[PDB]
Amino acid sequence: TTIMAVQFDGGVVLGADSRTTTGSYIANRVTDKLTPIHDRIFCCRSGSAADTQAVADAVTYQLGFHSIELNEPPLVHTAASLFKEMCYRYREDLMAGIIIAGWDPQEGGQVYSVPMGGMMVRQSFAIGGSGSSYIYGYVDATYREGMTKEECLQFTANALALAMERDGSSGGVIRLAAIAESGVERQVLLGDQIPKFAVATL
């Protein structure tokens, strides 16, 4: 897997590849790793499919109930806190590297990483999963403060494409999402629409 999210002024962009593996068999080549947790809050999932699905459904329940009770949209920070509590408490029984991102009216676009082990840290942008290793140098060189939504989308799509080419456990299509006050816009980059970088032939 490769997952990523990026903050912009007014919202966030999220992305993932779509490969599920068992050993080196691809058990799903068009996985949706970006899961809505509330109207404007998504999580990107990596690690165990069973664990991250069970945890996401659980936090979706908790957050929904909390939100009805308060009669307000939930904070992104709350959603991240609930993932953190469950990923930290059960760190010995789960394999879950999560990114929580979304929009709320109080703090705007936010990205949090909850990596394995269950720590939580807010970041400008975050990457995770097995393929993230191959894009540290690329994201560190290419990231600029103040990118627009569109720039965040391209930056995300490029990073993911690079990771997907190299990481055997990542691949398929690139699913993207942008979240802002106005709502959630999702799209899929497939085939020729995935950014392309030549193999370096002699």
């Binding site: 909390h66 009770e69 308060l70 904070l75 920070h77 709350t78 991240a80 806190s81 609930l82 953190k84 509590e85 109080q106």
Partner: protein, 239 residues
């Protein structure tokens, strides 16, 4: 007889044991809260039952979270237990959700706990009413009051205890929406002095607390110098 258990309705559909608990709050001396432009102020008429007691003994004003004050009337041991419940709820909320509990949610949660003691022969209703006050830039000023049945509402001004009505009628004279906490403490002290029956109960301490822009959203005791001035204003206004 129909009034011995909170698990027995009377034939008219009342729960007398809750009503009796309410009578314990109505026997108590008066506490008031006022919400204003930039915060919430609490004042309590704190009867001193012996000169042997220290200043500050039997406080009726509590910090239940850093941003939330509580003012009580009724049986004081029940109120204190409720202050512990409220504290525990604010603490647990912060642990689970990662931010300071919103006032309304805290009020509703502790109200459901009060409510749970009005259903059963196994336990008795709490003999206390209490107000919760907070302020934040995001939520503004908020003042809630909960009674022994577990009802919880929000208020501009509120009073509990034995001169409740007299206090309300004075609170209604204020245009509190446009006043600051610094102005309102004086008026709180004034009102407690008005409703205090100096013939029947001889000595009292005024207890004051506030939470607002001026304390940066922290619930704090009103400083000693400001309380003394407010007392002096209240006393001379009585004239």
């Amino acid at each position: 007889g129909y009034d011995l258990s909170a698990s027995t309705f009377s034939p008219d559909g009342r729960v007398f044991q809750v009503e009796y608990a309410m009578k314990a709050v109505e026997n108590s001396s008066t506490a008031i809260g006022i919400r204003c432009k930039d915060g919430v102020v609490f004042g309590v008429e704190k009867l001193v039952l012996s000169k042997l007691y220290e200043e500050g003994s039997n406080k009726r004003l509590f910090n239940v979270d850093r941003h939330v004050g509580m003012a009580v009337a009724g049986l004081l041991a029940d109120a204190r237990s409720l202050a512990d419940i409220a504290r525990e709820e604010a603490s647990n909320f912060r642990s689970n959700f990662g931010y300071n509990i919103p006032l309304k949610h805290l009020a509703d949660r502790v109200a459901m706990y009060v409510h749970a003691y009005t259903l059963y022969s196994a336990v008795r209703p709490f003999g206390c009413s209490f107000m919760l006050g907070s302020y934040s830039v995001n939520d503004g000023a908020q003042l809630y009051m909960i009674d022994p049945s577990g009802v919880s509402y929000g208020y501009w001004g509120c009073a509990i205890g034995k001169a409740r009505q007299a206090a309300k009628t004075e609170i209604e004279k204020l245009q509190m929406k446009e006043m600051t906490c610094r102005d309102i403490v004086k008026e709180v002290a004034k009102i407690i002095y008005i409703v205090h029956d100096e013939v029947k109960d001889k000595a009292f301490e005024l207890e004051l607390s506030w939470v607002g822009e001026l304390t940066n959203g922290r619930h704090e005791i009103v400083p000693k110098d400001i309380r003394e001035e407010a007392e002096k204003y209240a006393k001379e206004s009585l004239k």
